[PDB]
């Protein structure tokens, strides 16, 4: 048997996933077929439309010996490995899986991000952000980000007044925050791209004069998110 997961991806919260899963190879490999779940540092467990969820569908196409899991309404806590397997018959041998991250900002002005790109490893990059409610001179501004099968990190923020800045070290040489208070918005300079870097990004802001905070938690506003994908 040589089980193989595919179709996730990294996608927001409110968002919607397909996987797909070919049982194969030279012994029977009955399509009677589940789901497993396992949530990053934790033990794999079953999911099934049946656990607890009006959100997930499990179909099948019996001519391709494969089997789907729809998943709608993706909530963060879906984050996860998925691996297909039996759920009667009992352990196939385990296939590579399929990583499902669900992104999700933290916590008026209304935040803005500029769209990103698909960018070459090594390449550059700039991300804006921009009020539309209101004056964005009197916040703190901040860019979180959230990479495939991670948590969301803190990348950086710079002060009403632009004369604090401050970098999570995994990008201390390369980004660059800023802004124009002229044209209401901030930005990241992102040089150097990698791997590592390919997330959704969210811009997100607060009112100071307070600490300079590194949590999401501190942050009222926040934009949707966008997508930087870096390959090579």
């Known amino acids: 048997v040589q089980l193989v997961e595919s179709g996730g991806g990294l996608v927001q919260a409110g968002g919607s996933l397909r996987l797909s899963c070919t049982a194969s190879?030279?012994?029977?490999?009955?399509?009677?077929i589940g789901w497993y779940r396992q949530a990053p540092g934790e033990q794999r467990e079953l999911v099934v439309v049946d656990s607890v969820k009006g959100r997930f569908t499990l179909s099948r196409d019996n001519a391709k010996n494969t089997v789907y899991l729809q998943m709608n309404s993706l909530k963060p806590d879906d984050t996860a490995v998925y691996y297909c397997?039996?759920?009667?018959?009992?352990?196939?041998?385990w296939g590579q899986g399929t990583l499902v991250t669900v992104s999700s900002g933290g916590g008026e002005v209304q935040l803005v991000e500029s769209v990103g790109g698909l960018v070459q490893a090594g390449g550059s990059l700039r991300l804006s952000c921009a009020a539309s409610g209101r004056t964005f001179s009197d916040y703190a501004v901040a860019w979180f980000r959230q990479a495939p099968g991670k948590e969301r990190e803190f990348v950086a923020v710079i002060t009403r007044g632009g004369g604090s800045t401050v970098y999570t070290d995994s990008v201390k040489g390369r980004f660059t925050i800023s802004r124009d208070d002229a044209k209401n918005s901030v930005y990241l300079q992102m040089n150097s791209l990698k791997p590592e870097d390919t997330a959704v990004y969210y811009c997100a802001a607060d009112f100071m004069r307070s600490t300079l905070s590194y949590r999401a938690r501190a942050y009222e506003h926040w934009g949707q998110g966008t997508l930087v994908t870096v390959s090579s």
């Open positions: 397997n039996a759920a009667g018959n009992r352990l196939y041998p």
């Open positions: 190879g030279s012994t029977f490999s009955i399509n009677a």
